[PDB]
């Protein structure tokens, strides 16, 4: 068995010796190798060093070729042999990468064997133009109540997850990946969504714990993890968002739908700033190069919703940006805000108070908006958005309002229930029917008698009663696609029956 | 107007070499100016005191051109190489007199069409090895070509043959071949 | 799961053991007559690549 596999790997790995156009390393240092030779080499062509490291031909000069090393530059010495790969920089793509953890070059790192991909795709492909795109009209279900109602994400949208450190940015992104299991297990392939998680500059232990979480929840079957951790070279962390984007662009161009998370692009900008400063390029704002905007703009513009003449596929991007002391006016976050289609802002102050996810409702924007959410969610979240705005205006009167009007007290009481409604535990994403029912109960006044400290327990028990005793209500909602006034009266009665049965 | 060199040589030292090549090929002194430059370079290597004297930036350029002129009359250099070294000492460019000569040697090697071949073997061999290696290397030649063969010995490649050409290279050696096979063993399953 | 992990652990140590055994056996088995035969094959392969043009 093992001997047969070992024998067929020896026989299958034929050397195929032939003369290759080669170069010679002149000087190596600061992640840049200057190579003498390679007359017929192309710009941005991948090379092979004698130690096995890959590199990208960045600068073509009359006398030398500047090569960006995809690895540690201690493996390259002056006078080494640099061979042309003959191809511009590309990574393996396909459905053979699902369930596999790879580095920025596409090589597996989880030890599960090689990757049997038959296709490769360039990492520097330009984004689709005006014509092949179409409007974003299919929902992206993150499973988060506060996201899917107030900052609704569509398929083909770029939604920024921005905040300070340890505010739940990875928690939102991972729960969005886990939530797609209910759609991937179903037979409806148009709602199926593949996932690509790109870890840039993170800790390798953190990536391993993420892969364990995806494996336990069975979310790894449709997920590709591209890992360029903090121990990896800056060119590897620079390349990894484009490598993962190419793997996600395989699904976009083949009629399927993919979600990609760049966690985080602020660390990729640091890696690119390191490469730019070691190339003597003129620093700008916060020592960043001038093309650090084009670094993220050429990446995120490849996340698009394609027209029916292009297969109808899509790529959805969730870039992550870490701020410093909640400063969204800094250079790098302002660049990504000008690129993406809206941002989800996470507050440190809300995170300290126990509000998780600590989403700032007033500072979270979805430029697509209601155009990419279901009728039932849009009809209810429109009312909740108005009521949260009303609660926000009168929140200043709660500080000293010992005596307050009945209308203002109702607005304060409703806003407290709605704020407690949006709280959600980690690694427990919710189906869209469960989200609609819970938000509908809190927005119609059913929770005005329920204490805010018992809303989460009411959320489990009342949904269980609906899922067991009143399944005909859900069937009517699923058939109609919205909430009828007849169903509104029925939901009023079963809420009154449920609260009376719990206590009287 | 300058005559195009057979190959492109880069740097300021290559600019002087292409200027000297173009001037020598507009006239009929290509072989003459190559002969005295090689003999000058051999004279500088055989007498390191001359090389230290020319490269000394303290000495005035009049002493340099007198020393250059005194050692170039014995070379029977007539017009081009004398003006070439006078131009090198007129500027502060005679510090790399070895650089321009080496660049000029590179131009003239491609003028004759010679292609450098580097063949590395674990142990030296002749007779049967050298006869077939010459014919095998001659098969890469386009018409109007010559072979400059350099043989090397290195026990780090176990055995096999590491043969290189002016821009092409192969690694058909035992050490690299078992290395990728062992890499295939570790990455098998 | 216990039998699968036991099989995987035994497979991994057997793969490691056979790798170092093969490396040591290949390195210790060097003969000059085979080395000359491989040298002749390398020259013939180099001559074949020169013809292939």
């Amino acid at each position: 068995e093992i001997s047969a596999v070992l024998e067929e790997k020896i026989l299958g790995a034929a050397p195929k010796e032939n003369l290759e156009e080669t170069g010679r390393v002149l000087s190596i240092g600061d992640g840049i190798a200057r190579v003498y030779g390679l007359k017929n080499i192309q710009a941005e062509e991948m090379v092979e060093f004698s130690s096995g490291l890959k590199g990208m031909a960045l600068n073509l000069e009359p006398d030398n070729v500047g090569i960006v090393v995809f690895g540690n530059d201690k493996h390259i010495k002056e006078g080494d042999i640099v061979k042309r790969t003959g191809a511009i920089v590309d990574v393996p793509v396909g459905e053979e990468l699902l369930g596999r953890v790879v580095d920025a070059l596409g090589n597996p790192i989880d030890g599960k064997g090689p990757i049997g991909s038959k296709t490769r795709q360039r990492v520097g492909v330009k984004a689709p133009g005006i014509i092949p795109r179409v409007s974003v009209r299919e929902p992206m279900q993150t499973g988060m109540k506060a996201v899917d109602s107030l900052v609704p994400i569509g398929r083909g949208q770029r939604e920024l997850i921005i905040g300070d450190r340890q505010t739940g940015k990875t928690a939102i992104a991972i729960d969005a990946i886990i939530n797609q299991k209910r759609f991937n297990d179903a037979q409806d392939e148009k709602k199926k969504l593949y996932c690509v998680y790109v870890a840039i500059g993170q800790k390798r232990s953190t990536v391993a714990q993420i892969v364990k979480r995806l494996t336990d929840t069975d979310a790894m079957r449709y997920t590709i993890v591209v890992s360029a951790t903090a121990s990896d070279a800056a060119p590897l962390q620079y390349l990894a968002p484009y490598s993962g984007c190419a793997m996600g662009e395989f699904f976009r161009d083949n009629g399927k739908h993919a979600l990609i998370i760049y966690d985080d692009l602020s660390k990729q900008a640091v890696a690119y700033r390191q490469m730019s400063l070691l190339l003597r390029r003129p620093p700008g704002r916060e020592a960043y190069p001038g093309d650090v905007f084009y670094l993220h703009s050429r990446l995120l513009e490849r996340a698009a919703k394609m027209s029916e003449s292009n297969g109808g596929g899509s790529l959805t991007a969730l870039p992550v940006i870490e701020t410093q002391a909640g400063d969204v006016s800094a250079y790098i976050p302002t660049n990504v805000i000008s690129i993406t289609d809206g941002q989800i802002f996470l507050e440190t102050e809300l995170f300290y108070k126990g509000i998780r996810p600590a989403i700032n409702v007033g500072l979270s924007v979805s430029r697509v908006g209601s155009a990419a959410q279901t009728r039932a969610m849009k009809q209810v979240a429109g009312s909740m958005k108005l009521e949260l705005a009303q609660y926000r205006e009168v929140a200043a009167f709660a500080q000293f309002g010992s005596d307050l009007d009945a209308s203002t007290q109702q607005l304060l009481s409703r806003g407290v229930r709605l704020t407690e409604l949006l709280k959600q535990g980690q690694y427990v994403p919710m189906a869209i029917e469960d989200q609609v029912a819970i938000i509908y109960c809190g927005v119609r006044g059913h929770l005005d008698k329920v204490e805010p400290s018992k809303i989460t327990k009411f959320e489990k028990e009342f949904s269980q009663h609906i899922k067991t005793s009143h399944r005909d209500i859900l069937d009517t909602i699923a058939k109609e696609g919205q909430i009828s006034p007849d169903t509104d009266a029925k939901l009023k009665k079963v809420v009154t029956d449920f609260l009376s049965t719990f206590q009287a | 107007q300058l005559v195009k060199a057979p190959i492109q040589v880069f740097g300021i030292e290559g600019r002087y070499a292409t200027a000297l090549y173009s001037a020598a090929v507009k006239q009929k002194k290509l072989e003459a100016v190559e002969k005295d430059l090689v003999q000058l370079n051999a004279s500088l290597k055989k007498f390191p005191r001359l090389g230290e004297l020319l490269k000394n930036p303290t000495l005035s350029r009049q002493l340099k051109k007198d020393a250059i002129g005194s050692m170039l009359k014995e070379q029977k250099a007539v017009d081009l190489t004398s003006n070439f070294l006078d131009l090198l000492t007129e500027n502060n460019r005679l510090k790399m007199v070895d650089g321009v000569i080496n660049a000029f040697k590179t131009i003239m090697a491609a003028h004759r069409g010679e292609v450098i071949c580097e063949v590395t073997s674990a142990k030296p061999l002749d007779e049967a090895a050298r006869k077939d290696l010459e014919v095998a290397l001659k098969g890469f030649l386009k018409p109007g070509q010559n072979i400059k063969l350099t043989l090397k010995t290195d026990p780090a490649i176990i055995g096999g043959l590491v043969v290189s050409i002016g821009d092409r290279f192969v690694d058909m050696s035992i050490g690299t071949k078992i290395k990728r096979y062992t890499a295939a063993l570790k990455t098998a399953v | 799961d216990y039998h699968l992990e036991t099989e995987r652990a035994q497979r991994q140590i057997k793969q490691k053991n056979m790798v170092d055994w093969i490396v040591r056996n290949v390195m210790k088995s060097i003969t000059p007559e085979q080395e000359r035969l491989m040298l002749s094959k390398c020259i013939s392969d180099l001559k074949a690549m020169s013809i292939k043009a």
């Binding site: 001997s3 070992l6 024998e7 020896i10 026989l11 034929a14 050397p15 | 035992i174 071949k177 078992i178 096979y181 | 140590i13 057997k14 053991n17 056979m18 055994w21 093969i22 056996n25 290949v26 088995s29 085979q34 035969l37 491989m38 094959k41």
Partner: peptide, 28 residues
């Protein structure tokens, strides 16, 4: 259609390992 002699040597070392391992009752 001549095979690589190193590949043949590697196959012989695999067969030699397999014969010695089966003669050792599966032990290392």
């Amino acid at each position: 259609k001549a095979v690589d002699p190193i590949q043949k040597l590697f196959l012989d070392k695999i067969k030699e390992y397999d014969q010695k391992s089966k003669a050792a009752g599966g032990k290392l």
